[PDB]
Design a protein around this ligand. Structure first.
Ligand SMILES: C[S@@+](CC[C@H](N)C(=O)[O-])C[C@H]1O[C@@H](n2cnc3c(N)ncnc32)[C@H](O)[C@@H]1O
Ligand SMILES: [Ca+2]
Length: 208
């Protein structure tokens, strides 16, 4: 379980910065013993970092991949098979968080999800996205990719893991940060901000 996380740091620029930024944003917002929804939770890496900071948290992990959720169950809290496009779990949440998941939805799916997240959030609640974002112009996307490659080089990520990541990027529907911040505003979030960024990777949030 520590080996994967070590691999994730090799593959993701500023992994600690962007994940911690989300944890700290949540921690500054939510009441003690908060209820948290983790969308596209995977192995539960984001749910874990939040629990470490806020041990009394009630966390609900959602992911369409049973294989991923099994390992999450293994790391650990509720776990649920579900698609991001499906209705969110009921009951309301103090925070909704997501890491490297939402960029797989169509732009129409993202905007609809943003609205449904807003509706799931209790007053004062926060949505935080740790996200892969697109360069706004081709030269910027080339720079973003170059910077990603520089990280993978420096951290000596295994060749096959980088190749697999490259492959999975063919299923991406990334867009630039500014556009999706605007969509947050459009979805009825009171305040939106980018907390942290390292070229292609960014943590942003909206409050209801
Ligand atoms: C790159 S992994 C991120 C895992 C975890 N959130 C993290 O930050 O380490 C993307 C995850 O999103 C999930 N996912 C992608 N599209 C999804 C969808 N439409 N509905 C549900 N889960 C989805 C995948 O199953 C996978 O577990
Ligand atoms: Ca992806």
């Amino acid at each position: 379980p520590t080996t994967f996380d070590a691999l994730r740091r090799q593959l993701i620029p500023s992994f600690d910065l962007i994940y911690e930024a989300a944890v700290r944003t949540v921690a500054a917002t939510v009441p003690t013993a908060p209820r948290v929804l983790d969308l596209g939770a995977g192995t539960g890496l984001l749910s874990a970092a939040i629990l470490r900071e806020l041990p009394d948290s009630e966390v609900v992990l959602v992911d369409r991949s049973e294989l991923m959720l099994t390992q999450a169950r293994g790391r650990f809290v509720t776990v649920q098979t579900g698609d991001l496009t499906d209705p969110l779990p009921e009951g309301g949440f103090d925070a909704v968080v997501s890491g490297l998941a939402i960029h797989h939805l169509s732009h129409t799916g993202k905007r609809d999800l943003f609205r449904r997240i807003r509706e799931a959030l209790r007053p004062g609640g926060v949505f935080v996205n740790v996200e892969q974002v697109q360069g706004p112009l081709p030269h910027l996307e080339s720079l973003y990719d170059s910077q990603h490659e520089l990280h993978v080089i420096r951290e000596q990520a295994p060749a096959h893991e980088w190749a697999a990541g490259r492959e999975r990027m063919k299923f991406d529907v990334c867009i630039d940060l500014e556009t999706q911040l605007q969509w947050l505003r459009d979805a009825g979030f009171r305040s939106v901000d980018c907390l942290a960024k390292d070229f292609r990777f960014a943590t942003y949030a909206g409050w209801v």
